[PDB]
C-alpha cells in the first residue's frame, strides 16, 4: 500500500520462527533496535504488529524509534519509547513504471501532528486561513497529496524502497506467539542432564511400562520426586533414576 495508507496488521496464536529474517542477506537491511535481533527467536511476545509500505530512498532512515522527519511527522508517528525492528529493501525493479509509478501518494502538510500508531486519511484540501478551500487550491489552500515520481532516472535519495516495521509486545495476559525450539536426539542408559518441557533434572532414563491417561505428562512419587516422564515428540514412558552415589 501507499505511504499515507500504511497498513497495520497484528499476529497472534502461532510460533514466530524469525529464522528467515536472520539469514536474510539478499534483502538490504534487517535492523532491530529495541532488543538484540539475533537473540529474539528464542524469546516470546504476546503480540507482534507489522506496518508495511513503500517509501522514498531518503525516508528509509527516517522511520526509526525516536527518529523524526517529514513522513515521520505527518504520515507515521513513531513514539520515542518504541521497541521494534525495521526491514527495508530496494524495490526499484517493481515499484517503478516506465513512465513513472504514480500509484503512491504521500501527504506532507497537516496542521497538527498525528498521534502515534494512528492512520488518518483526511483528504481535505488544506485550509490555512479563514477562506474555505473547498476544491480551491493555491495560496492558503494546499493540494494535500503529492504523487511519488518513481523513475530509473531518480537519484538514490528519491528511489522506491519497500519498508516494514515490527513492534513486539508482551502484556499482562498470557502470551501466544513464542519462538520455536530445537529438540536434541534421545539418549538411554547414561547419567545425563535432561530437560523435558521446562521440567529439569539429572539422571539415567530407561524404557518403562507404566500406563498414562491420554492427557497426562509427568509422574511422581510419595515424597515429590519425579519418577516417570512422557517423551514429548513421540509418546513413550521413561523411568528416571539418579546416577549411582555411595561411600568409598
Amino acid at each position: 500500500a501507499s505511504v499515507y495508507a500504511w497498513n497495520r496488521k497484528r499476529i497472534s496464536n502461532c510460533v514466530a520462527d524469525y529464522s528467515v529474517l536472520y539469514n536474510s542477506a539478499s534483502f538490504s537491511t534487517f535492523k532491530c533496535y529495541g532488543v538484540s535481533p539475533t537473540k529474539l527467536n528464542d524469546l516470546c511476545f504476546t503480540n507482534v504488529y507489522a506496518d508495511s509500505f513503500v517509501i522514498r530512498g531518503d525516508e528509509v532512515r527516517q522511520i526509526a524509534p525516536g527518529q523524526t522527519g517529514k513522513i515521520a511527522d505527518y504520515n507515521y508517528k513513531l513514539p520515542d519509547d518504541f521497541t521494534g525492528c525495521v526491514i527495508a529493501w530496494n524495490s526499484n525493479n517493481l515499484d517503478s513504471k516506465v513512465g513513472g509509478n504514480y500509484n503512491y501518494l504521500y501527504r506532507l502538510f497537516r496542521k497538527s501532528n498525528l498521534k502515534p500508531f494512528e492512520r488518518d486519511i483526511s483528504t481535505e484540501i488544506y485550509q490555512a486561513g479563514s477562506t474555505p478551500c473547498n476544491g480551491v487550491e493555491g495560496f492558503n489552500c494546499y493540494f494535500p497529496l503529492q504523487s511519488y515520481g518513481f523513475q530509473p532516472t531518480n537519484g538514490v535519495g528519491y528511489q522506491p524502497y519497500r519498508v516494514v516495521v515490527l513492534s513486539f509486545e508482551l502484556l499482562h495476559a498470557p502470551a501466544t506467539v513464542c519462538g520455536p525450539k530445537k529438540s536434541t536426539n534421545l539418549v538411554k542408559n547414561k547419567c545425563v542432564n535432561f530437560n523435558f518441557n521446562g521440567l529439569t533434572g539429572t539422571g539415567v532414563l530407561t524404557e518403562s511400562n507404566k500406563k498414562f491417561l491420554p492427557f497426562q505428562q509427568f509422574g511422581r512419587d510419595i515424597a515429590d520426586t519425579t519418577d516417570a516422564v512422557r517423551d514429548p515428540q513421540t509418546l513413550e514412558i521413561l523411568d528416571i533414576t539418579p546416577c549411582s552415589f555411595g561411600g568409598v
Partner: antibody
Amino acid sequence: QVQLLESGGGLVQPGRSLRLSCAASGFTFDDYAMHWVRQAPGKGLEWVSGVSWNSGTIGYADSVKGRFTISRDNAKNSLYLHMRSLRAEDTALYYCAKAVEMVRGLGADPEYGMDVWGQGTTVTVSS
Amino acid sequence: DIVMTQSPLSLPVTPGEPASISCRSSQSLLHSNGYNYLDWYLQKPGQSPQLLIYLGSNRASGVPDRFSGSGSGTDFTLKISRVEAEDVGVYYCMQALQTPFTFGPGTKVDIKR
C-alpha cells in the same frame, strides 16, 4: 448475512468533490479485495477502480487519472471513495463490489472475482 | 487502453442450439504457468448481477456447469449447451491480468420470436 450498506447520497455540482462509503456485513473485510465498478445507462459494466486485500490501490482510470482516489478502513470494516474536482462528464452510477477468493489460495495473491453487488444511489453530477 | 470485445452483440437462441458468444482480447490470456486469467460474468435482467466462470476453466459455485469459456490467447467463446428458460440475460467477459481491467460489452440474450 452479507449486507452492503452504501452511504453518501445527495446532489453534487461539477467542480466540487464527492465521497462514498462502503460498509460490509456477514464477512470479514480484510480477506477479500474490494473493487469499484460503474455502469452508465445504455452501456455495460466497466471497471473504475479497485484495491487489493492488502489495501493496496491498483491505479486510476485512463479517463479520470489524477482526480479519483480510493482507500480502505480495516479497523472499522469500512471503505472510502473520494472524487476530487469532479466534472459533469463523470456522471454515472457507482458500484461497490467484493472479491471471493479465500486467502492464500496459491501462484499469486487471491484478489479477483467480484460476486456480490447491492445498489448505488442517485448520483447526479449537475449544477 | 486494453480493449476486449464481444460478438455478436445479440443473437436469439432457442433450446436446441448452444448459446455461443466470442470474446476478443488484446493480451495473451493463457498465462505461462498452466493457468488462465479470464473471468466471465452474468447479469439476470431484474436481479442483482452474477458471475459465470472463474479463470476461463475453473467452475464457479452457484452456477450450472454448462457454462464454458474456452479458447486460447485472445480468442475465447462462451458456450452454454443446455439453457433453461430463465437464462435470458446480459453477458460480460473480464480480464484478470493488469490495469486497466476491461469488461467486455454486455450482450443481451433475450427471447426469440
